[PDB]
Amino acid sequence: TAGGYFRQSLSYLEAYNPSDGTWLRLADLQVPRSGLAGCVVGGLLYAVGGRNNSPDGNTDSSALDCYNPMTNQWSPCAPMSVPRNRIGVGVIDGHIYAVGGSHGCIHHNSVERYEPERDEWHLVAPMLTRRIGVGVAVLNRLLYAVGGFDGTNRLNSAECYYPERNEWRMITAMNTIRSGAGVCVLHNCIYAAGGYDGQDQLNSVERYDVATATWTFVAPMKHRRSALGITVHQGRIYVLGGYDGHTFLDSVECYDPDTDTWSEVTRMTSGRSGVGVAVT
Numbered sequence: 069t070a071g072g073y074f075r076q077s078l079s080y081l082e083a084y085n086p087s088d089g090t091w092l093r094l095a096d097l098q099v100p101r102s103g104l105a106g107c108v109v110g111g112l113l114y115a116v117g118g119r120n121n122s123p124d125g126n127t128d129s130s131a132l133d134c135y136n137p138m139t140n141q142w143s144p145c146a147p148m149s150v151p152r153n154r155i156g157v158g159v160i161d162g163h164i165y166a167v168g169g170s171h172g173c174i175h176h177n178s179v180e181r182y183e184p185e186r187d188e189w190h191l192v193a194p195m196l197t198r199r200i201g202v203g204v205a206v207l208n209r210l211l212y213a214v215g216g217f218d219g220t221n222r223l224n225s226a227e228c229y230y231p232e233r234n235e236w237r238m239i240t241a242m243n244t245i246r247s248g249a250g251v252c253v254l255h256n257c258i259y260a261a262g263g264y265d266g267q268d269q270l271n272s273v274e275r276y277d278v279a280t281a282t283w284t285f286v287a288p289m290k291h292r293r294s295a296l297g298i299t300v301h302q303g304r305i306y307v308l309g310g311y312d313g314h315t316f317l318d319s320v321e322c323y324d325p326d327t328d329t330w331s332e333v334t335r336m337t338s339g340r341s342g343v344g345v346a347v348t
């Protein structure tokens with residue numbers, strides 16, 4: 069987990085061990101950020117976009133920054149073409165897709181691709197929808213923009229990116245309006261967890277099966293949370309932090325699919341929301 073928000077933007081980089089339950093402190097971000105996404109290419113942990121909320125400013129980020137796990141050092145990579153706060157990212161065969169996000173009052177539908185060994189960015193097909201707080205996930209080498217906020221409406225729609233065809237295709241919408249949901253793939257179906265619908269923070273969770281183009285609910289999380297971090301470790305889903313309408317959780321819940329149950333597995337070292345997350 070990289071970055072996050074609690075009273076201001078965070079530089080924290082911490083790792084959770086689901087075996088012994090403890091948390092490992094690691095090298096701070098060069099620049100604090102909330103509303104960023106995390107991802108892994110070549111075993112390297114990347115932190116994309118976001119925003120530095122502090123008592124001195126609120127600047128959206130175009131930064132891309134790389135952390136080496138054996139080296140514990142951050143390096144500047146090329147910036148995106150535009151700042152993207154509340155971004156979604158997905159990895160397709162070692163490439164970085166930066167999706168949506170905001171810059172001030174501007175709500176991006178644009179998408180951009182980064183080449184890790186070549187350190188370059190280029191724009192591609194824009195989404196059909198302007199999406200802030202978009203969940204992004206890759207399933208069967210296909211990219212999914214899920215949920216989010218267009219500036220007026222929070223979204224239950226979802227659209228799919230075809231790399232080779234470089235086109236966006238709307239798909240079946242979710243049952244539930246979700247902005248700032250945690251979105252990932254677990255088993256072989258896209259999971260969208262929690263989020264915010266313009267009125268409430270959500271605990272419901274729903275999964276999309278490609279072969280039936282259908283969304284189905286599963287067990288809700290224990291705690292309603294938007295701006296949660298999401299990733300998949302040892303065949304299970306992990307939700308981290310987020311906001312519930314009253315407090316910034318350190319609560320971490322773990323979904324068991326076999327039973328279809330969630331359980332709180334740890335507390336973060338400090339309550340927070342809006343982190344970037346990836347796994348090694």
Ligand SMILES: O=C(O)CCc1ccc(O)cc1
Pocket residue numbers: 154200201216217222247248263264294295311341
């Ligand atoms: O729709 C929202 O306004 C944008 C995304 C967003 C959702 C929840 C949250 O706590 C922070 C950000």
